[PDB]
Each structure stands twice: as C-alpha cells, then as structure tokens.
Design a protein around this ligand. Structure first.
Ligand code: COA
Length: 96
C-alpha cells in the first residue's frame, strides 16, 4: 500500500464518531494500536508489564507480537486490517 493510504487509514480511524455505522471492538483496537506503534516507533519499548495492569500488559503483548517488522510492513497491514474490519460491518473503506 502507498504511504498516503496509511495516513488516510490513520485519519479515518481518528475521525470515527462515537455514534456511527463503524465501531471498533477492543480486539480490533489492540490490533490497530500494535500496527501503529510498529510502523511509527519501531520495536516495543520496555519489558512485559505486570499482568494486573491489564491494559498496559495487553498493549505491550500486542506490540511485542509485531516485533521484527519494518515500518512499511506494518503500514500495509494497518490498511488491510482497516479494509477488512470495514467490510464485515457493512461499510467497506478502501484507499485511493
Ligand atoms: C495515551 C492515550 C491516553 C492518549 O493517546 P493519543 O491521544 O493518541 O496520544 P499519545 O501520543 O499520548 O499516544 C499515541 C500512541 O499511539 C497510539 N495511536 C495513536 N494514533 C493511533 C492510530 N491512528 N491507530 C492506532 N493507534 C494509534 C495510541 O493509542 C498510543 O498511546 P501510547 O503511546 O500510550 O501507546 C491513549 O493512548 C491511552 O492510553 N488510552 C486510550 C486508549 C485506550 O483506552 N486503549 C487503547 C488500547 S485498548
């Protein structure tokens, strides 16, 4: 995918209204969070947090799951995941 396709995917996620036809579940939120961090900040920072800290632990595990990818590898995955999660919910989003 093109770079502007990723920047538009990030904008579409950030422009999603509260009440709308597209609502991201928590699993999809973790997926987009992991791919975004992998394509913008590189590999995961820090060690595996306390499991009691459920959110921080969940975010670190998702980010560590993508460890070893280049930024361009994760940007296409971010676009593809957005195209898929928009199709199964009745409103397909596609770039360009
Ligand atoms: C830190 C926080 C309070 C504010 O995030 P923000 O307004 O995007 O700005 P920040 O620069 O502080 O954080 C951006 C980082 O990239 C992520 N991000 C930004 N834009 C994104 C996008 N388009 N797609 C995916 N992840 C994105 C943020 O989730 C993340 O926070 P982190 O640094 O703590 O991991 C928010 O990330 C948070 O921790 N809580 C809200 C999210 C939440 O409750 N759960 C998310 C995982 S289930």
């Amino acid at each position: 995918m093109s770079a502007a396709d990723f920047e538009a995917a990030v904008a579409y996620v950030r422009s999603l209204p509260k009440d709308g036809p597209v609502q991201l579940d928590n699993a999809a939120k973790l997926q987009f969070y992991s791919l975004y961090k992998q394509a913008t900040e590189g590999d995961v920072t820090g060690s595996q947090p306390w499991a009691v800290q459920v959110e921080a632990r969940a975010k670190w595990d998702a980010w560590n799951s993508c460890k070893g990818m280049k930024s361009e590898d994760a940007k296409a995955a971010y676009v593809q995941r957005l195209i898929e999660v928009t199709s199964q919910k009745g409103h397909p989003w596609n770039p360009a």
